[PDB]
Amino acid sequence: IPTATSTTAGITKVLNVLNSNDVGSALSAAQGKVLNDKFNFQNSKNQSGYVRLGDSGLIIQWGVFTSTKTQSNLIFPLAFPNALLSITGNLNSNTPDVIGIDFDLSTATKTSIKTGAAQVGASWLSGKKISWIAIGY
Amino acid sequence: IPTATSTTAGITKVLNVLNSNDVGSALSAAQGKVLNDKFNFQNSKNQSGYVRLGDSGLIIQWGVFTSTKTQSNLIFPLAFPNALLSITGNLNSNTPDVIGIDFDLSTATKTSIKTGAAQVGASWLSGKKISWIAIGY
Amino acid sequence: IPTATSTTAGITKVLNVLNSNDVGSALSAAQGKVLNDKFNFQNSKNQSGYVRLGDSGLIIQWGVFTSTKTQSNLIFPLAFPNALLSITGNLNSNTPDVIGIDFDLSTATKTSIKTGAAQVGASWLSGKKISWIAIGY
Numbered sequence: 466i467p468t469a470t471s472t473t474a475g476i477t478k479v480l481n482v483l484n485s486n487d488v489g490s491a492l493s494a495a496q497g498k499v500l501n502d503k504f505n506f507q508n509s510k511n512q513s514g515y516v517r518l519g520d521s522g523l524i525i526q527w528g529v530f531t532s533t534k535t536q537s538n539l540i541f542p543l544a545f546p547n548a549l550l551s552i553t554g555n556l557n558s559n560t561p562d563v564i565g566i567d568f569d570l571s572t573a574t575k576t577s578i579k580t581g582a583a584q585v586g587a588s589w590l591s592g593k594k595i596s597w598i599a600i601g602y
Numbered sequence: 603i604p605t606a607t608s609t610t611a612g613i614t615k616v617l618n619v620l621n622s623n624d625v626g627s628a629l630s631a632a633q634g635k636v637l638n639d640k641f642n643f644q645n646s647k648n649q650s651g652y653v654r655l656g657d658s659g660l661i662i663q664w665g666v667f668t669s670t671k672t673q674s675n676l677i678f679p680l681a682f683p684n685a686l687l688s689i690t691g692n693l694n695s696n697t698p699d700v701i702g703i704d705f706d707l708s709t710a711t712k713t714s715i716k717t718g719a720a721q722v723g724a725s726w727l728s729g730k731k732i733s734w735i736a737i738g739y
Numbered sequence: 740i741p742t743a744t745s746t747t748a749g750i751t752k753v754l755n756v757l758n759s760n761d762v763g764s765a766l767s768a769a770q771g772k773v774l775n776d777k778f779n780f781q782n783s784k785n786q787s788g789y790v791r792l793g794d795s796g797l798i799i800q801w802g803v804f805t806s807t808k809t810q811s812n813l814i815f816p817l818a819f820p821n822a823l824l825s826i827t828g829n830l831n832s833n834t835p836d837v838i839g840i841d842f843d844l845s846t847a848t849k850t851s852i853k854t855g856a857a858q859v860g861a862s863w864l865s866g867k868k869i870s871w872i873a874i875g876y
């Protein structure tokens with residue numbers, strides 16, 4: 466009975482893993498399904514949420530933070546396994562305000578970063594809504 | 603004639619779908635191609651464009667918006683099926699201007715968000731270019 | 740000896756490529772591994788780094804830029820093969836400063852973009868840390 470190859474039909478094993486480099490055995494249909502399902506990256510669609518970028522390790526997070534009277538903790542939807550790498554954010558308003566959205570990246574932790582809404586000339590402002598986007602791993 | 607398994611070469615079905623959990627039949631080469639092609643996530647490379655993050659549902663969008671004399675509609679390259687979740691943006695300039703890039707997230711729709719360029723002390727400014735990045739689903 | 744199909748077990752070829760649309764031959768286990776490994780998108784976890792969004796062509800980059808006395812070059816971690824499409828960024832501080840994070844997108848190149856930290860009323864400020872996020876291809 467012939468052995469299966471690229472050029473000749475024959476008998477073959479069917480392997481049910483994604484870490485075999487055997488060029489001469491078939492992948493199972495089940496592992497095709499596992500691979501397809503992996504495109505549905507782990508995520509949360511919450512107001513403040515996250516999405517894992519495949520198996521790269523990178524995680525994008527986002528949310529709406531409400532400022533307080535000091536530069537205070539913005540708590541990530543998902544703790545970063547390693548670190549926040551970068552973050553950006555903007556005022557959410559229906560009035561023409563110029564507010565400094567300032568992040569203390571130098572003291573960020575795996576779970577939070579100090580975030581504030583600065584007034585021109587003055588100190589931190591409370592009650593400002595800030596939409597932010599971050600990446601880390 | 604032996605039946606194919608992980609340990610014994612034999613005869614097998616070849617399944618041409620990505621939603622079978624059959625561990626004992628082969629996936630077709632054709633579905634390997636479908637899976638490979640799925641890494642080319644749906645997207646637009648336009649100045650204002652988007653990219654779908656696999657099958658997670660999340661969509662990143664970006665663009666260059668030109669401000670008007672009021673906080674006015676920034677129209678997303680792709681309508682969000684559900685909602686915009688977060689957005690950020692910056693002035694594009696070659697002069698040292700401080701302008702408040704302000705988004706009315708509270709009244710965003712699936713197709714647009716009111717966006718303006720605020721002057722310190724005064725109202726909305728027209729003709730300012732704003733590069734933005736958003737995520738939603 | 741029966742030929743493998745979706746409905747009948749039989750003999751089959753085993754193909755070791757990801758660009759065959761043959762519905763009647765098996766994909767190799769090895770190509771299942773290649774596909775799985777493709778979820779680990781090419782990236783750098785450096786302070787200023789990047790991640791490729793699968794095979795879509797889109798690349799997200801991020802970093803921490805230090806401003807100088809003029810609007811000066813922010814050098815991307817990875818040269819864009821085509822162009823930067825959008826960029827955002829924020830001051831990193833522990834003090835309530837309002838600084839204009841301004842990008843000259845109109846003169847960006849594949850390798851850099853002129854970036855500055857503007858003072859209200861005055862010119863560019865040196866020594867300001869800016870965390871940024873970009874997308875392009």
Ligand SMILES: [Br-]
Binds near residue numbers: 474751752
């Ligand atoms: Br054949």
Ligand SMILES: [Br-]
Binds near residue numbers: 481482608
């Ligand atoms: Br197995």
Ligand SMILES: [Br-]
Binds near residue numbers: 481482483484
């Ligand atoms: Br596995």
Ligand SMILES: [Br-]
Binds near residue numbers: 484485
């Ligand atoms: Br391996």
Ligand SMILES: [Br-]
Binds near residue numbers: 486
């Ligand atoms: Br290998």
Ligand SMILES: [Br-]
Binds near residue numbers: 486
């Ligand atoms: Br290997």
Ligand SMILES: [Br-]
Binds near residue numbers: 484486
């Ligand atoms: Br290996």
Ligand SMILES: [Br-]
Binds near residue numbers: 505506507517
């Ligand atoms: Br994932």
Ligand SMILES: [Br-]
Binds near residue numbers: 511512513514
């Ligand atoms: Br939430």
Ligand SMILES: [Br-]
Binds near residue numbers: 529
């Ligand atoms: Br809220």
Ligand SMILES: [Br-]
Binds near residue numbers: 533534535
């Ligand atoms: Br408070």
Ligand SMILES: [Br-]
Binds near residue numbers: 536537
């Ligand atoms: Br706090």
Ligand SMILES: [Br-]
Binds near residue numbers: 538
């Ligand atoms: Br807290």
Ligand SMILES: [Br-]
Binds near residue numbers: 542543544
């Ligand atoms: Br967590």
Ligand SMILES: [Br-]
Binds near residue numbers: 563721722723
């Ligand atoms: Br103002």
Ligand SMILES: [Br-]
Binds near residue numbers: 568569572833
């Ligand atoms: Br900092």
